[PDB]
């Protein structure tokens, strides 16, 4: 039905809700190009188990933020400015409504991340799938060479700032399920999408000297925080300097899991960390609150190793 | 565990793809500090392999399709006059056999070698029961850079302009569902006129036209290019051609692989149909002036391509043969 696809195409006045000036516009901007000091490109892609909730709940308008989230947060942590987004939706038989729903959510993370949805595609893959689909994302960011923050300016004792997560985000969702497969509202919280920190960082970097940043994905703080730390340097979190979610405290009891254990799977209520010079932590903490983020002095840098 | 340090070592297929421009390594980096463009523009694109993959599950050959994935992305780039810089892959599977995944990036690297782009990143997803054991998926994503003045869209193509076609490796990457439909209706893999084992003919990877296409452009005026993919000639030649301009194709100007013949004989297809699905031996078309047409043909063949004056531009609409 090429008619239904007609009115399915016009439906993407969604993508334009992501558009930026730089887009030498194709469709609504779909298919177009991106117009471009000492320019360096930063790219990323991200295909998680968090999709399982969506298949069941049959609710797909927010799963595409997480995606955008998991791509763009990792580019901006290198102080790069996200420009455009490409999506790949592997599909049994495209449910014209489902597709549109999922791209309704992609264009919402794109708006927030402040990048254009210049392209993407729905794959009719007859056989692999029945209520399922896979969602992939691709991103390109830009940075000035001498401005890349790659935390080698991380000196012992810097104040560590932690920006507030909305819940699980995109990781741990297999342990979540087993824990509450071992057990028995739940789903609205677990369908909570991953926060995007792109805009507030950018205006942060525009104002302050950011020593280093990290995105709390991987295996919790322990994987990710040291990740930014330089040799002979460390990171000590003052437990109780931020508000941890009922979700996390919840899985802590239910599965009866260990603290240090959970800290290596789950964000434990904190989505991102940037290292800051003790004399500035105050007003930049202020600045981010000014950005609608939950900033807090989570701990500090030390000379050593780990968390 | 111990098998991953080694599987991350054999990942050296990327080393074979690298350019000076690629900057050291949460998101690969490419330097644009020496490109000497004055109105620089980024042209990107993503595509997923498709129905061809089903035949790579059958033959258990996984190191070439990645050339298929790259080729589609990259040919769609240079055809607008850009230069592919870097590529990112996304592979989806139930779970990953480090080897099998190694063969996929192995043909992704190669394809990237030929396209001349860096393999700067990629994801590998061991998925639940969403994917079976044999069954996997493969999407790619490219970025190319062009100067705002050097873009080609076809609007400048005119009546009496000369269409050259660059030959293809065979089916490339389009029409395989209809191919399979007579695999069913037919009988499976050496058939008829000049021939390899049938499956082996079918799994021939898509041609990558990048390196020649940029050399062209460095030496001559190109008014259009069409990547003959989905919808074959009937879909893709029209789309480069402005209003009032149609196309005349001279059926004997190029070589049609026997598999297209087979498919038509065996499948009882019409020629119009065939040309609305299959490339029929020509993977990419480029409108040219008449006065250059013959130089261009040799520049391309000096490039290592097979290039034929395939037809011409007229007043009208769509495509017409003779």
From Swiss-Prot, chain A:
Catalytic activity: 2-formamido-N(1)-(5-O-phospho-beta-D-ribosyl)acetamidine + ATP = 5-amino-1-(5-phospho-beta-D-ribosyl)imidazole + ADP + phosphate + H(+)
Keywords for this protein: ATP-binding, Cytoplasm, Ligase, Nucleotide-binding, Purine biosynthesis
Protein localization: Cytoplasm
Main location: cytoplasm
Domain of life per record: Bacteria
UniProt EC number: 6.3.3.1
Enzyme class: ligase
Recorded GO CC terms: cytosol
Pathway where it operates: Purine metabolism; IMP biosynthesis via de novo pathway; 5-amino-1-(5-phospho-D-ribosyl)imidazole from N(2)-formyl-N(1)-(5-phospho-D-ribosyl)glycinamide: step 2/2
GO biological process: 'de novo' IMP biosynthetic process; adenine biosynthetic process
Assigned protein family: Belongs to the AIR synthase family.
NCBIfam families xref list: purM
Listed name of the protein: Phosphoribosylformylglycinamidine cyclo-ligase
Gene field: purM
Swiss-Prot record, chain B:
One Gene Ontology CC term in the entry: cytosol
Pathway: Purine metabolism; IMP biosynthesis via de novo pathway; 5-amino-1-(5-phospho-D-ribosyl)imidazole from N(2)-formyl-N(1)-(5-phospho-D-ribosyl)glycinamide: step 2/2
A biological-process GO annotation: 'de novo' IMP biosynthetic process
Subcellular location: Cytoplasm
Disulfide partners: none
Keywords assigned by UniProt, alphabetized: ATP-binding, Cytoplasm, Ligase, Nucleotide-binding, Purine biosynthesis
CDD domains: PurM
Documented EC number(s): 6.3.3.1
EC supergroup of this enzyme: ligase
Gene Ontology molecular function: ATP binding; phosphoribosylamine-glycine ligase activity; phosphoribosylformylglycinamidine cyclo-ligase activity
Family: Belongs to the AIR synthase family.
PANTHER family per record: TRIFUNCTIONAL PURINE BIOSYNTHETIC PROTEIN ADENOSINE-3, TRIFUNCTIONAL PURINE BIOSYNTHETIC PROTEIN ADENOSINE-3-RELATED
The name this protein goes by in its record: Phosphoribosylformylglycinamidine cyclo-ligase
